[PDB]
Design an enzyme around this catalytic site. Structure first.
Site, mmCIF file in Angstrom:
data_model
loop_
_atom_site.group_PDB
_atom_site.id
_atom_site.type_symbol
_atom_site.label_atom_id
_atom_site.label_comp_id
_atom_site.label_asym_id
_atom_site.label_seq_id
_atom_site.Cartn_x
_atom_site.Cartn_y
_atom_site.Cartn_z
ATOM 1 N N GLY A 133 0.749 -1.250 0.000
ATOM 2 C CA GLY A 133 0.000 0.000 0.000
ATOM 3 C C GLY A 133 0.791 1.319 0.000
ATOM 4 O O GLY A 133 0.186 2.384 -0.219
ATOM 5 N N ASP A 134 2.112 1.286 0.226
ATOM 6 C CA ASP A 134 2.906 2.530 0.249
ATOM 7 C C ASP A 134 4.155 2.499 -0.662
ATOM 8 O O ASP A 134 4.594 1.420 -1.088
ATOM 9 C CB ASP A 134 3.321 2.851 1.683
ATOM 10 N N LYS B 230 7.914 -0.280 -2.805
ATOM 11 C CA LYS B 230 6.612 -0.442 -2.183
ATOM 12 C C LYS B 230 6.713 -1.565 -1.134
ATOM 13 O O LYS B 230 7.079 -2.712 -1.447
ATOM 14 C CB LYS B 230 5.556 -0.749 -3.264
ATOM 15 C CG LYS B 230 4.249 -1.318 -2.717
ATOM 16 C CD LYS B 230 3.001 -0.951 -3.556
ATOM 17 C CE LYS B 230 3.066 -1.481 -4.982
ATOM 18 N NZ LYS B 230 1.873 -1.081 -5.817
ATOM 19 N N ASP C 178 -9.431 0.047 -12.660
ATOM 20 C CA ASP C 178 -9.145 1.228 -11.854
ATOM 21 C C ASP C 178 -8.444 2.304 -12.687
ATOM 22 O O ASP C 178 -7.387 2.821 -12.318
ATOM 23 C CB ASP C 178 -8.279 0.833 -10.645
ATOM 24 C CG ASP C 178 -8.448 1.776 -9.472
ATOM 25 O OD1 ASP C 178 -9.473 2.500 -9.435
ATOM 26 O OD2 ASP C 178 -7.564 1.780 -8.578
#
Length: 281
Positions: free
Chosen positions: A12-13, A29, A115
Site C-alpha cells: 500500500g505505500d 513499495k 481502476d
C-alpha cells in the site's frame, strides 16, 4: 537496507530507494508481512511491455514484503493540478493515444485494470519522460483464461470495485467489469481533463452510499452530447463506441486511436511529445 543491494527513503505505500550496485534511484513499495506479492506477480506477466514499470526485485526483509520497482514520474492528476487543471487539446490527444495503447496491452496479457483514473497514469523519468505508464494492479483481474482465452462469466448485482467518478455505467448497474469498462473509464478521464471536472463530481452526499447512488443517478441522467458539449465530436463518438461494446467483445482499439489521431492531424498537431507541462518555465 534491503536485498544486500538496495537502500530506503521517505516517499500500500511507496518509498524512494537506490539500486546501490548500479547507481539508480528506485521506488520501493512495502507491505507488513496479502497483496504485494500478488500484484508483484501480475507485473511479471506484464513485464517488458511499453508503459509497464519494471520490477527489479521481490522478497522479504524483517517484517515486510518488499517489491522494488523502477522510479517513475508524476501522476496525470498531479501534472493536471500543476497545470491549473487545464490541459490543451494537443495534450489530451497525445495522452489519449498512449493510454488506449496501455489498456490494450494489459488486455492483451489477459487482465483488465478496473481502476483507470488520472492517478494511475504516471509519466516516466529521463529518456522515458514522454512515456505514459500505467500502475496499480491492486484491483486488476484476469478476464479470460490464459490458454483457452475463455472470457469470464457475465455477473450481476456486484458491488462497485473502483473509483465511482470514473466507473462505467455498467459498473454502476452492478455488472461484471470487462475490457469495455477500462475503455469507458478512459473516456471519462479524457473529458475530465477537458472540462476540469465531471458533472457528477462533488455531489452532496451525507452517507458514503447515497453518494454512489447520486453519482450513478447523475451519470445516467447526463447524455453524452451534453457531457461533451463544446469539444471535438471525437470524444463523444468514443464514449458512445464504448457504451455499445458487448460484455465479451474485443474492443477495436485501432479504431479508437485512429479516431483521435485524425482529429489530431486535422488540428495540425504533430506527435513531438511536448506536453503542456513540458512548457512550464
Amino acid at each position: 537496507r534491503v536485498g544486500n543491494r538496495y537502500r530506503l527513503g521517505r516517499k500500500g505505500d511507496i518509498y524512494l530507494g537506490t539500486d546501490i550496485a548500479a547507481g539508480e534511484e528506485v521506488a520501493i513499495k512495502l507491505e507488513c508481512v496479502p497483496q504485494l506479492h500478488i500484484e508483484s506477480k501480475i507485473y511479471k506477466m506484464m513485464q517488458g511491455g511499453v508503459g509497464i514499470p519494471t520490477i527489479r526485485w521481490c522478497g522479504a526483509e524483517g517484517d515486510y514484503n518488499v517489491m522494488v520497482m523502477e522510479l517513475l514520474g508524476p501522476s496525470l492528476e498531479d501534472l493536471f493540478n500543476f497545470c491549473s487543471r487545464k490541459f490543451s487539446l494537443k495534450t489530451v490527444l497525445l495522452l489519449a493515444d498512449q493510454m488506449i495503447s496501455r489498456i490494450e496491452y494489459i488486455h492483451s496479457k489477459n487482465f483488465i485494470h478496473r481502476d483507470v483514473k488520472p492517478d494511475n497514469f504516471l509519466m516516466g523519468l529521463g529518456k522515458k519522460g514522454n512515456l505514459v505508464y500505467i500502475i496499480d494492479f491492486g484491483l486488476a483481474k484476469k478476464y479470460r483464461d490464459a490458454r483457452t482465452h475463455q472470457h469470464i462469466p457475465y455477473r450481476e448485482n456486484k458491488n462497485l470495485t473502483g473509483t465511482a467518478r470514473y466507473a462505467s455505467i455498467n459498473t454502476h448497474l452492478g455488472i461484471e467489469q470487462s475490457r469495455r469498462d477500462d475503455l469507458e473509464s478512459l473516456g471519462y478521464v479524457l473529458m475530465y481533463f477537458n472540462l476540469g471536472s465531471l458533472p457528477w463530481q462533488g455531489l452532496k452526499a451525507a452517507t458514503k452510499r447515497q453518494k454512489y447512488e447520486r453519482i450513478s443517478e447523475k451519470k445516467m441522467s447526463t447524455p453524452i452530447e451534453v457531457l461533451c458539449k463544446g469539444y471535438p465530436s471525437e470524444f463523444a463518438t468514443y464514449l458512445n463506441f464504448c457504451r455499445s461494446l458487448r460484455f465479451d467483445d474485443k474492443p477495436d482499439y485501432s479504431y479508437l486511436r485512429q479516431l483521435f489521431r485524425n482529429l489530431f492531424h486535422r488540428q495540425g498537431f504533430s506527435y513531438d511529445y511536448v506536453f503542456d507541462w513540458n512548457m512550464l518555465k
